[PDB]
Amino acid sequence: VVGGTEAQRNSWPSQISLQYRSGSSWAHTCGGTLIRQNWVMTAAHCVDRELTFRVVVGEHNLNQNNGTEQYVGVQKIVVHPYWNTDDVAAGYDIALLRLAQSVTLNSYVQLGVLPRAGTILANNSPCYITGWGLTRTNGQLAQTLQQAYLPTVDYAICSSSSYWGSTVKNSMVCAGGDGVRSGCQGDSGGPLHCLVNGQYAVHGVTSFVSRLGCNVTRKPTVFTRVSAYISWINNVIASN
Numbered sequence: 001v002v003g004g005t006e007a008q009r010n011s012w013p014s015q016i017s018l019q020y021r022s023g024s025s026w027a028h029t030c031g032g033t034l035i036r037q038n039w040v041m042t043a044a045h046c047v048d049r050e051l052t053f054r055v056v057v058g059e060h061n062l063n064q065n066n067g068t069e070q071y072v073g074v075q076k077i078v079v080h081p082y083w084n085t086d087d088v089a090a091g092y093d094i095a096l097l098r099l100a101q102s103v104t105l106n107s108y109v110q111l112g113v114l115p116r117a118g119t120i121l122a123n124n125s126p127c128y129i130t131g132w133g134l135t136r137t138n139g140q141l142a143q144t145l146q147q148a149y150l151p152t153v154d155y156a157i158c159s160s161s162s163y164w165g166s167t168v169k170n171s172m173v174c175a176g177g178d179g180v181r182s183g184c185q186g187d188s189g190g191p192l193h194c195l196v197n198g199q200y201a202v203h204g205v206t207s208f209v210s211r212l213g214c215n216v217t218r219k220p221t222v223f224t225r226v227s228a229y230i231s232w233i234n235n236v237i238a239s240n
């Protein structure tokens with residue numbers, strides 16, 4: 001997250017750290033959202049390789065041991081059937097990971113609330129992006145969970161010529177674009193928390209930014225629109 005601030009230790013309990021094993025060590029690669037005690041929602045482009053993964057819940061400081069962490073292995077990975085490995089622009093950037101063991105809920109680990117199917121937010125809706133991604137374009141990962149205020153840019157403006165054009169589809173949510181705050185490498189798959197009816201609901205799965213820079217003006221961070229995938233999510237979960 002570029003231009004963010006460290007989140008409070010129990011502010012976003014549904015945020016998870018998706019890590020892959022390199023050699024003997026583990027390394028954070030993407031974010032994700034706990035949606036069931038044994039299911040995590042993330043971006044398809046995070047779990048596209050045949051890597052060995054683990055999910056860390058109740059995590060705050062990537063390096064230090066906070067004492068609230070639960071590490072569980074990934075048992076099953078279900079990427080959306082229409083996801084094309086190359087294509088972040090084509091859409092369908094969503095995946096569900098079945099955990100090897102159910103996690104224990106407490107104040108540091110909670111389930112994320114999903115929007116009702118089809119829900120579209122009005123322009124400039126208040127949302128926050130969270131993650132341990134790069135704090136600067138070509139910089140390094142954040143040690144502690146970062147958060148940034150990233151209000152929505154409705155599709156009409158986002159899909160215009162001076163923003164993203166046809167790259168952004170109706171099944172995506174745009175947020176930010178002020179040139180100061182944005183998602184960045186390592187934030188992928190994480191949540192876009194939006195305040196709706198007094199409740200923070202997970203409206204997006206962090207997908208992409210401009211390869212020219214993370215915090216590029218008129219290039220808001222783009223997320224997979226969760227509300228467009230409610231039926232798919234429930235079908236997957238009901239089936240396995």
Ligand SMILES: *[C@](=O)([C]([N]C(=O)[C]N1C(=O)C([N]S(=O)(=O)[N][C])=[C][C]=C1C1=[C][C]=[C][C]=[C]1)[C]([C])[C])C(F)(F)F
Binds near residue numbers: 045
């Ligand atoms: C994730 O943290 C980051 N996501 C990506 O880098 C996804 N991404 C892109 O943002 C682009 N941008 S583009 O070239 O401007 N296309 C519109 C291209 C490719 C990818 C991509 C695809 C497949 C695998 C990895 C990256 C954050 C910036 C959200 C991360 F690093 F992917 F995990």
Ligand code: NA
Binds near residue numbers: 059061065066
């Ligand atoms: Na930690």
